[PDB]
Design a protein around this ligand. Structure first.
Ligand SMILES: CCCCCCCCCCCCCCCCCC(=O)OC[C@H](COP(=O)(O)OCCN)OC(=O)CCCCCCCCCCCCCCCCC
Ligand SMILES: CCCCCCCCCCCCCCCCCC(=O)OC[C@H](COP(=O)(O)OCCN)OC(=O)CCCCCCCCCCCCCCCCC
Ligand SMILES: CCCCCCCCCCCCCCCCCC(=O)OC[C@H](COP(=O)(O)OCCN)OC(=O)CCCCCCCCCCCCCCCCC
Ligand SMILES: CCCCCCCCCCCC(=O)OC[C@H](COP(=O)(O)OCC[N+](C)(C)C)OC(=O)CCCCCCCCCCC
Ligand SMILES: CCCCCCCCCCCC(=O)OC[C@H](COP(=O)(O)OCC[N+](C)(C)C)OC(=O)CCCCCCCCCCC
Lengths: 94, 86, 68, 89, 469, 140, 185, 78, 341, 171, 61
């Protein structure tokens, strides 16, 4: 019986439409989360992988920045409006 | 600071957490027997603390400077018999 | 490529027998490779612990029926 | 070695004998991957080796990406049909 | 070269509208050709079968893998010309065959996953690469999300491919549980005989082989190849089979398996029998791909199987492209368009094609008789080598099943030719539109190779007796 | 507890909301007494029928009142809600919010001064302070 | 006192069985996802039991934190109909369910051993009888743990797999966009 | 429109001024990300030559000598 | 194990009482910023307001709507409180003066801040009505989109010190606090903290749903109370992450020369005065940052969901994936990669 | 190796060593004085420790049974070191290892007592601390005049002694 | 590190001696449990003639 062990037990026991940016934000959270979680071993082995695993993780991050670039310039997460304001010109046949 | 009435509850919070941290310090110290708590202990430091428990009479973090060990030390050796994992 | 490495970043528990077996493979060609049998069996014993387990089962049988 | 095999088998059986919906199929896939990782990590401990944990972390990555792609594919199906009925794929 | 392609295309395509997609496909087509021309001299490194291990011991490079790499690129410069060069500049053929934006990226990523498999030396690289090849091909089926059947197809292929990736990983973890290794080079005659690994390795072979349609789990892949668009069917049907069969051939896993013998027999029987009543083209050609997967499965049991595999996989790929290309060209001369994605479905729509374009039918006959194994077409010299190897190693009942399967498959192969040389009312007499130049030259070149490549067989044998021996 | 935390619901404040908002203002802070206005009935105890209670609105009012969890009170702010006031003889008016809901305190005025509202709340706090919760059970 | 914590692994095995049956039997799928979360927790427990809390936490922050958030994020937005567990519809599978259970379990257990006689391959799996001694040595000098080792090998010995997982994640970005996002312009 | 894109190939420097004015949130991100690898390539040898050199590596394990054993004495029994 | 019970009860009392009076501190601080006063009538200067709101809500009906679930609306607030509370275990108030004292304390907090989302996820399923299930989705997308940005900062600073022990991370800040070399990360971490708690200027869903008939947290009784002891504790917790990551935690002026001058020996007085000084530095830092949550609330208007997801994935993430490259380069330039201890 | 997992009962062995293996005293010194004395031991037991690890390497599996003599000589060299310390430099050793125990065995918090100990043992036993593998350029961390990292609380007795010893010139 | 290095050989010597004592006493124990039987307990399951600590035992109870 440790104080962490005593505490981690005590506390508990005492039709529609959607925009596809709503769903992409979740679907894209996965890979970016796996990237930032795969970066943990680097930060905890950063000395032992001196200057080799540094370069390796940079090529890793650059490859991932590519996909981020693709996401931005597609404008995936932007919401798009249908009822546009008219910008044609007013032209009268004579 | 002008508005003392607004800072009183901050004074409650400040004093409660303050006394909580100082009291936990004294409690950890009384647990250890007059020494500050250890932290970031690895395999080696744990194995050495167990070796201390073998040399002193199981008295926690009490240290001993003797160049020669009591004869119990040779027979107090422990191995650890683990359950098969499934 | 990451073979023979432990959880602490060092040599595993059964590495040494694997080293003897790999040495004797390098010493021998496919015809003479039969010589590597006991080394391989030692490796498998370190891994899976079968013959020692059966040894202990015999000991336990003697403690179990021949006394009661 | 036991718990992983059991989750794997029961989840394969619940994948195969699901006459109800599809989210059970996704779930059974994820549970199969879980049971694999537990088998492998048990063996990696007993051998005191690292290749098992490496393949485990790799499985976690690949399974998460699997679920991402699967749940985009489902969204495409739903785009076109509007209802994911019990016996449709 | 693939990687710099995939990296550059992501940026260059995000910067580019929907209207540049054809030109971007044309660019990567020419780039792949420049690779295959200028970096092809690296075959010298594999003199006397000098084999190299790379990135530690994760990858393996020998003459087998290099030739497979060139073949996958030759496939991928022909499969790209089909998207980047419009046949006819008509509104119908714009609507029928228009590339999407992300398609080409997924193709190259699938090329990468294909090549990491064949080049793999450790199971970890295999599991990473088969997941890459698998996920990319889930998306390729699904990219045409404006169709109902493709949506159904990608969903089924996802689930039934996930199950097999589970089976593969279960097998690998078992091998590691037994032996504390992820590398097959850690096997040898001693370890094979000494340890009961037969179950643990056939489970690998099956988990890889059921991903290519091996019987009796052929139906799901056949429903997919039928339900997906024709220009996707021509890619999904080939590249995954090359990759996985090549990995299983290079690694001499199943030397004399009884299970593999049984299943391979069943594939030849199923793929020959069940394709007789089919009225649709794609199901017919899928059952053809299955029986050819049967023939190529039969050399997983040999231990000296490189020449027979390399010659058959090459002629299979060539005939497979050419026949699907003939079917694509014939859409101009039919009367009814069935879909925006599958303009041609039923074999009875090719009726009278001789009276419209006869030399298209000459190409179809050459290609069909190549599939059947009529000499002097390349298919003869491919099925001959398989018969030499299995009879040299001791499979006799299987050779008879092989002969019987070829005869039975002549019937569904000749259904096309029979209806094509039939007679038709309302023939074509003139047409001011003209098919593209490049696609005609590609089809012709594949035809001329199927026809006359028997001339070079000795030269190929000499080169093989140096670089593979 | 019931006094020091006195949370009305945002509903009922249609007309004459200015004088009620002035009781949320600096010079007369209601939050100093623990008053907090809430969007939702289910967390609230008090309803303030300010302004005109029209016939097009009374059912919505009764819904919000039944949705409140007991204990619940009602306090009628203004004349237009006590007896209809100025629009008593109109076609589109309930001549009193009594007709719909039960009222505990009636603040007079049109618009009642912020001080009148605070005094009414101090009368309501007195009502609940001379309430018998358990002593009545010890009688019952 | 000692043996109060002896059978925790068997408890987790029993609990995983329960959560699997509950995932299979639940009416509304949302409940089935909650039971999947219970199963990932039990797995994290078991991994702590055998000395890998790092993976317990990585699981809780990957699977539960993202994948299951997403599964609820989907079933909240889609009209995923169902068919509650029944007896007219699913009883027919009982003989095949039972045969498949017995065979697949006994094979999954026999497979891990190298004995030549079949029955002994299973009786070896059922030989979990003997305790494993743990000795203490003094050769490890650093504070290397499992995560540091994983970083070292993954970023030095197996760099290629890392630089391929980057492309798997590029697929995870780029495929879902292509599928969901219609680049009409 | 008022401040649309002039194109990277129709004047780099003019594009860089436009981006710093209208899209800083990308420009300064690119500048940050390029300033690391580039400086690591360029400035590192200067720091190694002029400021201070690279440290001598850490033991990492018992440094087993590369020699053959020598016969010693002292501290024997008795 | 008696003193372990004493130490737990001290901690729980201190944290929960701090939460209760953070409610009052929020209200009085916000008031004086608005040139008013109060609560200052329910106690001796309002020091009993929070317990009055509680006791009123515990004597209130437990009312459940017709078409709702009971178990989900009940356990989900309870599990939110639990998950928010267990993050307090790894939080140090002195060098090793911690209940957990794990070697993976960062990862524990990071996994528990991932478990937190489920309260908002299960809220929308408490209402079978259709709009609530989209309002919860908006409020989940903000959290999972901003947890990427909080994490990324945990990793950026752990590049400086290669250990997941919280005490070790604080002890490396004797030389300098990591808010001086990475000052912009202080803003980013504080912005994202305010977002993850769904606090203003990031209170989109509670406001957008306060207008609508639902899509909010329409609970009552005890679940209200637990949700308001889980919001005002996740606030302190996220403020603590800022403290022990960037602001030195418990660190302060070197009290070497003073303790040398005044004591002469290591007694059970010096240990107390030391733990007082350490915790007081840790506390005043939490106070200034809780003040900052309130300061921000008093000023800035609200965001919309498009502006907010655009802020995250197009402005913050690029800067961070840039910083991921500049800092390892900055260490490689100078031969200063940290060791594992 | 690994640590115990999921369950583990300590178990001893009440038996004695074989008669063909002679008897050797044990060091009997705990973590802190041992860590203080590490450098003085290594400066004196270097050849013996090296011969021990070499015979372990040459044996190739039988190290536990072939290296007993070498481990015995190592243990005796260590005992001679600590006996020389306790006989001669006791109080300074106690200052060092108590200053350590009131920290996390970080040597940075004990530099004053470490200085007094190095001085005394160098004057009497002729044993100096040395960190090898360094260049002549690198400055060893225990001799830096104004280090970046300093203890939370400099120990009291250590500080009084350091000041009195500078006044007495002993340092 | 260099301090923990200068200490390693000493401590591992201790552990080798206790390893020897226990691994030999275990065999002298089984000899007495296997008195009247032709079961060689000294016969090593390893075919090489190296020392090998048990790595297994019987549960104490
Ligand atoms: C992936 C989805 C997730 C679910 C996974 C489920 C668990 C997976 C189980 C294992 C993996 C699946 C294997 C797929 C079937 C193919 C197995 C195979 O082909 O191996 C055969 C192989 C021998 O074949 P071969 O090497 O070709 O020829 C030389 C023969 N001396 O090797 C063998 O000889 C096989 C060994 C023979 C023993 C087989 C064990 C059967 C025991 C079952 C007994 C059941 C009891 C009786 C009936 C009960 C019903 C009441
Ligand atoms: C010293 C010189 C520094 C060079 C700075 C580079 C200037 C960048 C120009 C710019 O402002 O980007 C604008 C560009 C297009 O944006 P826009 O015109 O507004 O249209 C998009 C909506 N349809 O935006 C884009 O095309 C997308 C840019 C996304 C950038 C976010 C990721 C930043 C990553 C930082 C790492 C830098 C290294 C990346 C290189 C990859 C190499 C493989
Ligand atoms: C990306 C672009 C980054 C390039 C930045 C280059 C800036 C060059 C600044 C040069 C200042 C040199 C001062 C110096 O001499 O530093 C030495 C000092 C070492 O400390 P010391 O106790 O003496 O130990 C040395 C043992 N050999 O201390 C050091 O070694 C470290 C000095 C760090 C100087 C600041 C570097 C960061 C500059 C801001 C960029 C990051 C912003 C985010
Ligand atoms: C290679 C591109 C394939 C793409 C498809 C085109 C077919 C090209 C075949 C050339 C193979 C070769 O010349 O090689 C012979 C190979 C081994 O030689 P190698 O190590 O690969 O060196 C080759 C170096 N090149 C690439 C610079 C030339 O033997 C084989 O088993 C191949 C069997 C293939 C049978 C198919 C015959 C087709 C007729 C070809 C009429 C020109
Ligand atoms: C509890 C003791 C009790 O029994 O209460 C006694 C009193 C009465 O409480 P009160 O009426 O609400 O406050 C008075 C509010 N005047 C308005 C009315 O408590 C208090 O004032 C505060 C108790 C000390 C606060 C501790 C912090 C003017």
């Amino acid at each position: 019986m440790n104080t962490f062990i005593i505490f981690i037990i005590l506390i508990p026991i005492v039709r529609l439409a959607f925009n596809a940016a709503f769903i992409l934000v979740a679907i894209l959270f996965l890979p970016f989360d796996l990237e930032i979680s795969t970066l943990l071993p680097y930060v905890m082995s950063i000395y032992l992988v001196s200057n080799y695993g540094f370069t390796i993780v940079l090529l890793f991050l650059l490859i991932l920045i590519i996909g981020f670039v693709y996401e931005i310039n597609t404008n995936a997460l932007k919401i798009n409006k249908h009822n546009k304001p008219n910008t044609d010109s007013l032209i009268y046949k004579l | 600071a002008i508005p003392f009435e607004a800072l009183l509850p901050y004074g409650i919070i400040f004093g409660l957490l303050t006394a909580g941290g100082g009291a936990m310090q004294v409690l950890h110290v009384y647990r250890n027997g007059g020494v500050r708590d250890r932290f970031a202990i690895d395999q080696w430091d744990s194995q050495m603390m167990e070796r201390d428990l073998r040399l002193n009479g199981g008295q926690g973090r009490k240290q001993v400077d003797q160049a020669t060990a009591p004869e119990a030390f040779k027979h107090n050796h422990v191995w650890k018999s683990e359950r098969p994992l499934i | 490529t990451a073979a023979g490495i432990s959880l602490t970043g060092g040599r595993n528990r059964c590495f040494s027998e694997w080293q003897s077996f790999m040495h004797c493979t390098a010493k021998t060609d496919a015809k003479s490779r039969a010589q590597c049998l006991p080394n391989f069996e030692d490796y498998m014993e370190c891994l899976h612990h079968t013959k020692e387990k059966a040894r202990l089962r015999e000991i336990e049988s003697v403690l179990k029926q021949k006394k009661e | 070695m036991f718990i992983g095999t059991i989750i794997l088998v029961l989840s394969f059986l619940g994948f195969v004998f699901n006459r109800r919906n599809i989210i059970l199929a996704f779930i059974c896939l994820e549970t199969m991957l879980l049971g694999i990782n537990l088998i492998l990590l048990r063996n990696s401990v007993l051998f005191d080796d690292i290749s098992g944990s490496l393949f485990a972390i790799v499985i976690i990555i690949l399974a998460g990406v699997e679920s991402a792609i699967g749940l985009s594919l489902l969204v495409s199906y739903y785009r076109l049909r509007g209802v994911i009925n019990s016996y449709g794929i | 070269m693939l990687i710099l392609a995939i990296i550059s295309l992501i940026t260059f395509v995000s910067m580019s509208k929907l209207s540049d997609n054809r030109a971007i496909i044309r660019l990567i087509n020419i780039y792949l050709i420049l690779v295959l021309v200028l970096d092809s001299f690296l075959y010298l490194l594999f003199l006397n079968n000098q084999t190299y291990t790379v990135m530690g011991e994760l990858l393996i490079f020998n003459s087998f893998t290099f030739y497979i790499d060139m073949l996958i690129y030759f496939i991928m410069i022909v499969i790209s010309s089909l998207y980047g060069y419009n046949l006819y500049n008509n509104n119908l053929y714009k609507t029928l065959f228009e590339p999407k934006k992300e398609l080409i990226i997924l193709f190259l990523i699938n090329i990468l996953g294909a090549l990491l498999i064949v080049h793999s030396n450790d199971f970890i690289t295999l599991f990473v690469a088969i997941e890459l090849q698998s996920y990319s091909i889930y998306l390729i089926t699904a990219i045409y999300n404006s169709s109902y059947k493709a949506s159904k197809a990608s969903m089924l292929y996802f689930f039934m491919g996930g199950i097999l990736s589970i089976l593969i990983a279960y097998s690998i973890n078992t091998y590691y549980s037994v032996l504390n290794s992820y590398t097959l080079h850690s096997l040898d005659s001693l370890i094979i005989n000494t340890l009961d690994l037969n179950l643990i390795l056939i489970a690998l072979s099956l988990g890889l082989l059921f991903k290519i349609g091996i019987a009796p789990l052929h139906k799901w892949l056949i429903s997919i190849y039928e339900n997906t668009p024709i220009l996707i069917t021509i890619y999904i049907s080939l590249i995954p089979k090359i990759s996985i069969l090549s990995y299983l051939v290079l690694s001499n896993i199943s030397i004399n398996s009884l299970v593999i013998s049984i299943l391979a027999i069943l594939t030849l029987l199923v793929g020959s029998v069940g394709g007789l009543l089919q009225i649709k083209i794609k199901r017919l050609l899928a059952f053809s791909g299955l029986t050819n997967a049967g023939y190529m499965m039969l050399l997983l049991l040999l231990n000296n199987n490189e020449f027979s595999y390399l010659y058959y996989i090459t002629q299979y790929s060539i005939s497979h492209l050419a026949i699907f290309m003939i079917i694509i060209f014939s859409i101009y001369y039919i009367n009814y368009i069935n879909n925006q994605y599958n303009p041609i479905i039923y074999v009875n729509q090719l009726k009278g094609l001789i009276h419209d374009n006869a030399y298209l039918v000459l190409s179809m006959a050459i290609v069909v008789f190549s599939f059947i194994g009529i000499p002097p077409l390349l298919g003869f010299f491919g099925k001959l080598n398989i018969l030499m190897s299995i009879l040299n190693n001791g499979y006799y009942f299987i050779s008879i099943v092989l002969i019987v399967a070829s005869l039975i498959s002549a019937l569904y192969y000749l259904y096309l030719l029979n209806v094509s040389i039939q007679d038709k009312n309302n023939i074509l007499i003139n047409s001011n539109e003209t098919v593209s130049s490049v696609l005609s030259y590609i089809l012709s070149s594949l035809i001329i190779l199927i026809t006359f490549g028997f001339i070079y067989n000795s030269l190929i044998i000499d080169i093989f007796n140096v670089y593979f021996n | 507890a019931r006094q020091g935390s006195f949370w009305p619901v945002t509903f009922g404040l249609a007309c004459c909301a200015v004088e009620m908002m002035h009781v949320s203002a600096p010079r007369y802070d209601q939050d100093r007494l623990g008053i907090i206005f809430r969007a939702s009935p289910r967390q609230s105890d008090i309803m303030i029928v300010a302004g005109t209670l029209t016939n097009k609105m009374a059912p919505v009012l009764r819904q919000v009142y039944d949705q409140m969890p007991e204990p619940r009170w009602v306090i009628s702010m203004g004349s237009c809600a006590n007896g209809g006031g100025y629009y008593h003889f109109s076609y589109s008016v309930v001549r009193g919010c009594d007709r719909i809901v039960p009222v505990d305190v009636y603040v007079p005025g049109c618009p009642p001064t912020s001080e009148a509202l605070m005094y009414g709340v101090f009368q309501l706090q007195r009502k609940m302070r001379n309430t018998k919760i358990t002593r009545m059970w010890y009688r019952k | 006192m000692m043996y109060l914590t002896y059978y925790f692994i068997e408890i987790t095995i029993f609990l995983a069985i329960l959560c699997t049956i509950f995932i299979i039997s639940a009416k509304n799928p949302m409940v089935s996802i909650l039971y999947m979360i219970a199963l990932f927790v039990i797995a994290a427990m078991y991994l702590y039991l055998i000395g890998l809390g790092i993976f317990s936490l990585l699981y809780i922050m990957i699977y539960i934190g993202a994948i299951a958030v997403l599964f609820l994020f989907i079933i909240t937005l889609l009209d995923i109909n169902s068919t509650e567990l029944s007896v007219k519809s699913n009883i027919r599978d009982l003989p095949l369910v039972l045969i498949s259970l017995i065979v697949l379990t006994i094979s999954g257990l026999m497979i891990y051993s190298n004995d030549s006689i079949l029955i002994n391959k299973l009786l070896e799996a059922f030989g979990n009888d003997y305790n494993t001694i743990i000795t203490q040595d003094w050769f490890n000098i650093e504070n290397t743990t499992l995560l540091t080792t994983i970083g070292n090998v993954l970023l030095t010995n197996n760099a290629f797999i890392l630089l391929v997982l980057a492309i798997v994640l590029l697929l995870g970005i780029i495929g879902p966009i292509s599928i969901t996002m219609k680049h009409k312009e | 429109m008022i401040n649309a894109n002039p194109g990277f190939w129709n004047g780099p420097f003019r594009y860089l001024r436009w981006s710093a004015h209208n899209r800083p949130h990308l420009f300064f991100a690119f500048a940050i990300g390029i300033a690391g690898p580039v400086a690591a390539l360029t400035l590192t040898p200067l720091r190694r030559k002029y400021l201070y050199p690279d440290h001598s590596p850490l033991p990492q394990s018992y440094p087993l000598p590369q020699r053959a054993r020598e016969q010693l004495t002292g501290f024997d029994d008795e | 194990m008696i003193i372990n019970i004493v130490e737990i009860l001290i901690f729980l009392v201190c944290v929960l009482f701090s939460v209760a009076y953070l409610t009052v501190a929020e209200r009085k601080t916000l008031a004086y910023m608005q040139r008013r006063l109060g609560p200052n009538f329910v106690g001796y200067y309002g020091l009993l307001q929070a317990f009055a709101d509680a006791v009123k809500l515990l004597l209130k009906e437990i009312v459940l709507p017709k078409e709702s679930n009971y178990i989900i609306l009940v356990i989900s607030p309870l599990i939110t409180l639990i998950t928010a509370l267990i993050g307090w275990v790894v939080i140090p108030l002195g060098p090793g003066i911690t209940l957990g004292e794990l070697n993976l304390g960062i990862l524990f907090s990071l996994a528990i801040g991932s478990l937190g989302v489920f309260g908002s996820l299960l809220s929308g399923w408490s209402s079978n009505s259709k709009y609530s299930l989209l309002g919860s989705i908006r409020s989940t997308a903000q959290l999972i989109s901003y947890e990427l940005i909080l994490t990324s900062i945990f990793i950026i600073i752990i590049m400086f010190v290669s250990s997941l022990n919280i005490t070790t991370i604080i002890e490396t800040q004797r030389v300098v606090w990591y808010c001086i070399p990475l000052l912009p990360l202080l803003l980013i971490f504080f912005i994202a903290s305010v977002a993850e708690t769904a606090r203003p200027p990031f209170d989109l869903t509670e406001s957008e749903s306060e207008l609508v008939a639902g899509y909010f947290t329409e609970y009552s009784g005890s679940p209200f109370v637990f949700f308001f002891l889980a919001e005002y504790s996740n606030i302190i917790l996220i403020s603590a992450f800022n403290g022990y990551l960037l602001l030195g935690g418990y660190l302060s002026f070197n009290y070497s020369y003073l303790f040398n001058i005044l004591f002469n020996d290591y007694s059970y007085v010096s240990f107390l005065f030391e733990g007082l000084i350490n915790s007081s530095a840790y506390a005043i830092k939490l106070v200034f940052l809780m003040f900052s949550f309130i300061w921000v609330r008093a000023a800035f208007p609200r965001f919309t969901y498009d502006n907010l997801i655009n802020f995250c994935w197009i402005i913050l993430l690029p800067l961070l994936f840039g910083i991921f490259l500049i800092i390892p380069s900055t260490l490689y330039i100078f031969d200063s990669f940290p060791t594992l201890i | 190796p690994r640590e115990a997992a999921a369950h583990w009962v300590p178990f001893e062995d009440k038996a004695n060593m074989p008669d063909n293996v002679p008897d050797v005293v044990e060091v009997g010194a705990t973590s802190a004085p041992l860590l203080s004395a590490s450098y003085f031991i290594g400066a004196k037991c270097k050849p013996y420790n090296d011969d021990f690890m070499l015979c372990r390497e040459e044996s190739q599996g039988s190290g536990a049974i072939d290296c007993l003599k070498e481990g015995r000589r190592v243990t005796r060299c260590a005992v001679s070191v600590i006996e020389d310390i306790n006989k001669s430099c006791l109080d300074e050793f106690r200052l060092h290892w108590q200053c350590l125990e009131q920290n996390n065995h970080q040597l940075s918090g004990c530099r004053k007592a470490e200085a007094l100990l190095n001085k005394c043992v160098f004057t009497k036993l002729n044993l100096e601390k040395k960190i090898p593998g360094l260049r002549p350029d690198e400055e060893p961390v225990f001799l830096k005049k104004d280090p970046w990292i300093k203890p939370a609380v400099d120990d009291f007795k250590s500080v009084r002694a350091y000041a009195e010893a500078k006044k007495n010139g002993t340092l | 590190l260099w301090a923990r290095i200068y200490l390693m050989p000493l401590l591992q010597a201790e552990e080798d001696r206790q390893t020897v004592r226990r691994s030999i006493a275990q065999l002298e124990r089984e000899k007495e449990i296997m008195k009247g039987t032709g079961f060689d307990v000294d016969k090593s399951v390893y075919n090489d003639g190296k020392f090998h600590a048990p790595a297994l035992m019987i549960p104490p109870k």
